[PDB]
Amino acid sequence: KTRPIERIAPGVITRKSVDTPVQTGIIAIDALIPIGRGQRELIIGDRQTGKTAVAIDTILNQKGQGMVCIYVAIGQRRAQVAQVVGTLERFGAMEYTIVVSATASESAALQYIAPYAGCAMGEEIMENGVMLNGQLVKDALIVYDDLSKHAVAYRQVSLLLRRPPGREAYPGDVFYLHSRLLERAARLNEEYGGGSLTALPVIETQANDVSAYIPTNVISITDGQIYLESDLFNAGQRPALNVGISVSRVGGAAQTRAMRAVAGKLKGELAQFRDLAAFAQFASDLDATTKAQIERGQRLQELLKQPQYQPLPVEDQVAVLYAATNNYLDDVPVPLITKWRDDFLAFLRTAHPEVRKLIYDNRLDRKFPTPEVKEALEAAIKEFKATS
Amino acid sequence: EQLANARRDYEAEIARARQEAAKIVAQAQERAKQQEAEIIAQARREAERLKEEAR
Amino acid sequence: EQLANARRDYEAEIARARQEAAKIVAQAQERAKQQEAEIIAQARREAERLKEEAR
Amino acid sequence: AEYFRDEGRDILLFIDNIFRFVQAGSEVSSLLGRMPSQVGYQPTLGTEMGELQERITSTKRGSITSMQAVYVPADDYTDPAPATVFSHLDATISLERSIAERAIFPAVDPLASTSRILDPNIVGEEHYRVAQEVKRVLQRYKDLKDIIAILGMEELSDEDKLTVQRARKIELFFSQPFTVAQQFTGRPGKYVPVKKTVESFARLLNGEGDHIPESFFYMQGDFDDVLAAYEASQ
Amino acid sequence: AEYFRDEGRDILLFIDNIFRFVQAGSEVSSLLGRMPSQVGYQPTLGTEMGELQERITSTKRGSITSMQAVYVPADDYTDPAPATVFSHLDATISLERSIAERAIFPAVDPLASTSRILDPNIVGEEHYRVAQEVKRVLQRYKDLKDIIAILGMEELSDEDKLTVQRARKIELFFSQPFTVAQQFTGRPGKYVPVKKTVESFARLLNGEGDHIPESFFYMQGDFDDVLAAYEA
Amino acid sequence: PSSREIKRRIRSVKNVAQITRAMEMVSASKMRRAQRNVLATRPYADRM
Numbered sequence A: 001k002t003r004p005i006e007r008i009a010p011g012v013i014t015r016k017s018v019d020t021p022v023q024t025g026i027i028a029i030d031a032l033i034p035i036g037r038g039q040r041e042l043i044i045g046d047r048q049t050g051k052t053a054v055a056i057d058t059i060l061n062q063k064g065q066g067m068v069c070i071y072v073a074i075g076q077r078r079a080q081v082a083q084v085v086g087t088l089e090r091f092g093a094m095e096y097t098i099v100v101s102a103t104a105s106e107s108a109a110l111q112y113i114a115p116y117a118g119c120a121m122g123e124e125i126m127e128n129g130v131m132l133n134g135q136l137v138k139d140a141l142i143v144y145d146d147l148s149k150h151a152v153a154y155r156q157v158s159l160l161l162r163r164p165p166g167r168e169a170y171p172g173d174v175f176y177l178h179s180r181l182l183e184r185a186a187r188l189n190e191e192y193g194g195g196s197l198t199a200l201p202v203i204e205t206q207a208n209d210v211s212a213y214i215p216t217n218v219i220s221i222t223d224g225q226i227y228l229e230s231d232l233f234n235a236g237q238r239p240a241l242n243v244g245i246s247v248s249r250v251g252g253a254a255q256t257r258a259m260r261a262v263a264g265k266l267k268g269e270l271a272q273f274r275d276l277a278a279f280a281q282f283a284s285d286l287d288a289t290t291k292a293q294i295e296r297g298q299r300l301q302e303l304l305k306q307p308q309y310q311p312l313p314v315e316d317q318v319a320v321l322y323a324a325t326n327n328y329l330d331d332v333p334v335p336l337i338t339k340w341r342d343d344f345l346a347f348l349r350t351a352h353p354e355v356r357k358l359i360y361d362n363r364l365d366r367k368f369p370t371p372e373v374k375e376a377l378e379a380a381i382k383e384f385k386a387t388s
Numbered sequence B, C: 001e002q003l004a005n006a007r008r009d010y011e012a013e014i015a016r017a018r019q020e021a022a023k024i025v026a027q028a029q030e031r032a033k034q035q036e037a038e039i040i041a042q043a044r045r046e047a048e049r050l051k052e053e054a055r
Numbered sequence D: 001a002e003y004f005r006d007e008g009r010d011i012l013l014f015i016d017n018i019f020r021f022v023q024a025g026s027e028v029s030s031l032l033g034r035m036p037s038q039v040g041y042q043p044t045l046g047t048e049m050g051e052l053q054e055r056i057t058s059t060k061r062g063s064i065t066s067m068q069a070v071y072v073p074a075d076d077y078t079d080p081a082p083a084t085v086f087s088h089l090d091a092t093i094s095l096e097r098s099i100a101e102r103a104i105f106p107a108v109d110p111l112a113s114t115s116r117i118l119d120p121n122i123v124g125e126e127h128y129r130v131a132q133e134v135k136r137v138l139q140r141y142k143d144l145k146d147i148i149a150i151l152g153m154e155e156l157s158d159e160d161k162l163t164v165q166r167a168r169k170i171e172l173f174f175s176q177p178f179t180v181a182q183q184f185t186g187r188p189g190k191y192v193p194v195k196k197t198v199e200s201f202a203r204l205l206n207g208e209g210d211h212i213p214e215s216f217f218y219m220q221g222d223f224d225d226v227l228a229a230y231e232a233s234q
Numbered sequence E: 001a002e003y004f005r006d007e008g009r010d011i012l013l014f015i016d017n018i019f020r021f022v023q024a025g026s027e028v029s030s031l032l033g034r035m036p037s038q039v040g041y042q043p044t045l046g047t048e049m050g051e052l053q054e055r056i057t058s059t060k061r062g063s064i065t066s067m068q069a070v071y072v073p074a075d076d077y078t079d080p081a082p083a084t085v086f087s088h089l090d091a092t093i094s095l096e097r098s099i100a101e102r103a104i105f106p107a108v109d110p111l112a113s114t115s116r117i118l119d120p121n122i123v124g125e126e127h128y129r130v131a132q133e134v135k136r137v138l139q140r141y142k143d144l145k146d147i148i149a150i151l152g153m154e155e156l157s158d159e160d161k162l163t164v165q166r167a168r169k170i171e172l173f174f175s176q177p178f179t180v181a182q183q184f185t186g187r188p189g190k191y192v193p194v195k196k197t198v199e200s201f202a203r204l205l206n207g208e209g210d211h212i213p214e215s216f217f218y219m220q221g222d223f224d225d226v227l228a229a230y231e232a
Numbered sequence F: 001p002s003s004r005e006i007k008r009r010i011r012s013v014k015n016v017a018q019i020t021r022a023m024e025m026v027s028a029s030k031m032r033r034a035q036r037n038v039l040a041t042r043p044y045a046d047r048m
C-alpha cells in the first residue's frame, strides 16, 4: 500500500503526553536533554559540527529498542550519503532503518517532497506498524537532516514559480511548509494506536546565528533544541553541546527515573561550573568550595565527551553518572577520565554484568539507587578503583 | 620507651601491610577469574547469536 | 625516622601490592579477550558455513 | 467570547500567537494575487488586525480580560506584524532572547515592557514609585553596558557601581519558578502577591540585601525567601 | 575530465575562482528574468551548484579530486555564495600574505586550513594526534606573539619558551622543495610521504632535533634530511 | 542596524582597541622600569 504525503497531522485530541524515553547513547544528550518517543527535538549547529554524527549515533543506539529509524537526506552530497549508509551497514543498524536520498545534484522538485515522504513512512509506522525482531513496533525515529537546504529548495521552486518573496527572499509559506512537515510527528494516545514518532530535524546556521529566519521558525515549532557550538567542537569536546541554553521543553517526564534522578544534580553542578567559568581566570584567589566546583565541572564536562560510534547503554549511562556525581571520581585527574570511563564500562561488562541487568530492570522504580543496586554499584566501583 | 613501642608498631604495621597485601592480591584473583568466565560467556552467547541470525 | 620509616614502608608495600593486583588482573583480562576474539572469530566462521549450506 | 461578554459575564480571553493568524493572512493574500506589502505581508494587514483586535474590547454590558500572544519573526521587533500589534495593547510585555539564554525563564525585559494602567491613581503611589525606580535602575545599566563590557567594573563611580550591582540583583530577582515548570525544573513554583513583590523590590532598592550575593536572587519569590536562603547559607 | 576518470585514472581538477562561476550563474538567471535570491543571486543556486561539483567523486573505476579557488565577497563567510561553496567542501587551505613574505613558498596557514578527513577513523590515530599537537603548539605560538611583542621572550616561562622555539622550528620546517621550482631555486624537490611526514613531525615534537637551531629545517624534507644537514 | 550606523560602531570600537593596545604596552614599558627600580633599591633595604 501507499501512504499519501502532504496530509494533515492527526490532530490535538489524537495525542498523548510522551512518556517512553529514547536512549540516544550520548551522555550529554541522554542526561541534560531527555528525549521521549513522539517528541520533536531540534539538532542545530554550525556547518561541520557533528549534527549528522549525533543523528547517526542515535540511529545506531536503537538496535534493540523496538525502534524504527528514518534518515532522510536533503541536498546532501552523494559522498556523504554513501558514507552514512556504509556506516549504518557496518554496525548492522541498516536492517531496521530506511534512508531517503534527496541529493544536491537532484532537481529542486526533489529535496522538497523527500522529508514529506519520510514523514509518510513515519506515519505508516505510527498507524499500521511493522514486524521487527518478531514483534510489532509502532514507534519510529525520523531524522530529516539539514532542513535549511530543504527551505532553499522550496525557495527555488517558489521563485521559479514567480511567487512573491518574503523575509530573506523566502516564500511567505515556508513556516507553513515546515510546520505541516513536522507537526505530523506525534505521540498518539491509546485509542488511536499509541504509536510515537520522534523527529530530529537538523539546521545549518552561519556564524552561530540562531536568530536567522528558518532557525527561529524551527525552534518555535519544535519542542526542544540542541545547540551545537562550533567553538566547543574545536575545543576537543566532540559532542559539543551548549548546555547553558540547550533545553527540551518536553521529555523530562518522559525519562527513565534513574536517569533523571542521577542527572538532576549533574545539571545543577554543571550550572555551577558555567557560573564559575568567569572566576576560573583567577589563580589562588578562589576558596576550597569554588575550586572544588571548578574541578567537578571540568571532570563532568570531560566525562560528557564521548567518541563517535560508541553508543552507551542506559544502564551504563546511569552507572557512570552515579559514579561521577557521588564524589567517587574526585581523585581521578581530568585528562584520564575518558579512558577511566572506558575501563569502568569494560569492567562492568566483564566483572558485574549482573549489576548492569539489575540496573536495567530496576530503572522503572521511582528511586534509582535502591539499597541493593546502590550497594552493589558502590561495591563494584570500589573494586574497580582497587584494580586501578 | 617511645622508641621500643614505635619499633613494635612498625613491625605491626609492616605485618599489617603484608596482611593487607594478602587479600588485595587475593581479591584480584577472583576478579581475574570471574571476569574471565563472563568474557567467555559473553563471547559464547554472542556466538549463538551470530549463528541464529545466519540461519 | 622510625615512624617515618614505618609510614613509608607501609605505603611502599601497599603500593607494590596494588601494583601486583593490577598486573595479574591485566594478564587475565588480556588472556580472556583474545580467547573472546578467537571465539568471535570462530563464531563468524561457522556462520560463514551456514550461508554456504543455504547456497 | 462576544456572546458571553454581552450578557455581562466576565470573560478571561487567551488568544495565542496572533502572529500565526497574520502569517496565514499573508500566505492567503499572496496566493490570492494581491501584491506583497513590506516583507511579503498582505497589503490589508492593518485592516485585518483592526477587524480582529477591535472585537476584543471590554464594553459597558460586559468586560473581556484578554491576554494575547505574539511571535516575533526571527528576533526582529520592527517586523510589520508586531508593530501593528503594538498599537492595540494596554500593557506591553517583551521577551528577549538574551534574557532567556541568561537562564531567566520569565525572560521579560522591564525596559521594553510598559503598561497603561501603571498609574499611581490606579495601581498605587508606592507601586508606581517602585516601578519607576526599578526602571531607572537597569536604565542606568543599559546605558553602562558598553562601558562594563569594555573598560570593566572599576571605571564606574561608587554610586554607579552601586546602581550596577543593584541592577544585576534586580534582573536576577526578576526570575521566578513556575508551578508548570516542574517538568524540566526541580524548583517548586512560587506565587508572589503584588504587594509582596512591591515590598521586596522596595526593600532591595532601599539598600537591604546589598551584602547578599547576587546568585541568591535566582529562582526566588519574595525578598523573605532570599533572606532565608542567605541565612541558610550563613 | 570524465573521459580520463572513466579510464580508471586519478584526475586533479583545478577551478579558478568558483565564485566567478556563481556570479556568472547569477547573471544568467537575472538575464533570463528569474527572481533574485537573497543577495540578488540566482534562485537556482543549490541546484546549479549541485549539477556541478557532484560529478567530482571517487568512483570504483576512478577518482577525481578538485582543487577550487574561492573568492569571498567582501569578508562574509556567511554570504550565500561562500556558504554554499563550503557546503560541498571537504578540506580548506588558506594561504596567507605574511607567511609568504618570509621565504616559505608553501605558505599554508595551519590554523585557518582545516579538513574534514582529519579524524582518527581514516588517517589513523597517530596522524590525528600529531596534527592536533601541532595545531595546539602553533595556537600557543600565535597567542604568545602578543606577549613577546609587548614584553619580550624573557617573560616567557620555562617549558613555554621551549614551545615558542619549537613552533618557530616547526613552521620553518613547513617549507618543502618543489620539483617545479627546481630550476628557479636550484634545489631539487622532495616528495614526503604521509607516513614519513607524520613520523618526522612526531619525532620533532617528542624532543628530537631541539638542539638543532631554527635553521637546517628550512627548505627541507623529512627529519632524516634535517639530521643529515645538521651533521654536515 | 542600518548597515552604516554599525560601521561607525565598528570604527569607534576598532579605535578603542588601538588606544588600549597603546595603553597595554606603555604600562608594560613602565612596568619594566618599575621592576628595575625595585631591584636597584633592594640592596639598600636588604643591607640595613
Ligand SMILES: Nc1ncnc2c1ncn2[C@@H]1O[C@H](COP(=O)(O)OP(=O)(O)OP(=O)(O)O)[C@@H](O)[C@H]1O
Pocket: A045, A046, A047, A048, A049, A050, A051, A052, A053, A054, A238, A239, A306, A307, A308, A309, E116, E117, E119
Ligand atoms: N564524537 C565525535 N568524535 C569524533 N569525531 C566526531 C564526533 N562527532 C563528530 N565528529 C566528526 O565531526 C565531523 C563532522 O561530522 P558531521 O558530518 O556529523 O557534521 P555536521 O555538524 O552534522 O555537519 P556536516 O553534515 O555539514 O558535516 C566529522 O569528521 C566527524 O567524524
Ligand SMILES: [Mg+2]
Pocket: A047, A048, A049, A050, A051, A052, A053
Ligand atoms: Mg554532518
